[PDB]
């Protein structure tokens, strides 16, 4: 599976899904768990690549403050340059599930 059960249940399309690995307060990207559902326009692609790293930092920052808790499932909605990102640990104590799509 390139997607995740949680990611397959998202509704908005197109979307970029990924399950990141949490080391301390650092989120690691794993391509084997990254996927695109639907399709982004040629214009959105480079744009999405620029906003992705910003969502990651936002999320790492939320794990430090506690807003995001590895032990408790709780979804958050983030924004950045016309894009939205839903992120949730699902209380996995090690993973952070995300979905990025146009607002």
């Amino acid at each position: 599976m390139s997607n995740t059960t949680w990611g397959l249940q998202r509704d908005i399309t197109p979307r970029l899904g990924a399950r990141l690995v949490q080391e301390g307060n650092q989120l690691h990207y794993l391509a084997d768990r990254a996927s695109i559902t639907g399709k982004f326009s040629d214009a959105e692609c480079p744009k999405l690549d620029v906003v992705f790293p910003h969502f990651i930092s936002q999320i790492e920052s939320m794990l430090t403050t506690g807003e995001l808790n590895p032990r408790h499932a709780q979804c958050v909605t983030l924004y950045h340059n016309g894009f939205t990102c839903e992120a949730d640990t699902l209380g996995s104590c090690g993973y952070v599930y995300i979905a990025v799509y146009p607002t």
Side-chain angles (χ1 to χ4, degrees):
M1 268 188 92
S2 51
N3 222 307
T4 59
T5 297
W6 185 84
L8 277 172
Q9 311 195 322
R10 301 302 90 207
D11 300 297
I12 300 77
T13 296
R15 60 165 183 290
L16 163 65
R19 184 185 77 180
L20 302 310
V21 173
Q22 193 187 171
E23 269 190 52
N25 281 320
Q26 292 212 305
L27 295 183
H28 297 300
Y29 175 80
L30 285 70
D32 81 306
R33 282 296 183 164
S35 71
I36 297 291
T37 296
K39 174 191 185 181
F40 286 100
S41 69
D42 296 335
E44 304 178 308
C45 281
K47 284 181 184 60
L48 178 51
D49 299 323
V50 173
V51 299
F52 188 76
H54 190 269
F55 280 127
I56 298 296
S57 60
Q58 288 196 200
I59 290 176
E60 303 184 304
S61 170
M62 288 177 88
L63 289 158
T64 300
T65 65
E67 295 184 70
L68 231 57
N69 196 102
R71 319 197 309 183
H72 295 60
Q74 28 185 267
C75 206
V76 298
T77 306
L78 311 173
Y79 300 96
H80 189 58
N81 279 61
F83 280 95
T84 301
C85 172
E86 283 175 55
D88 195 322
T89 296
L90 298 189
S92 60
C93 294
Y95 296 124
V96 61
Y97 304 87
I98 65 171
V100 178
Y101 48 83
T103 308

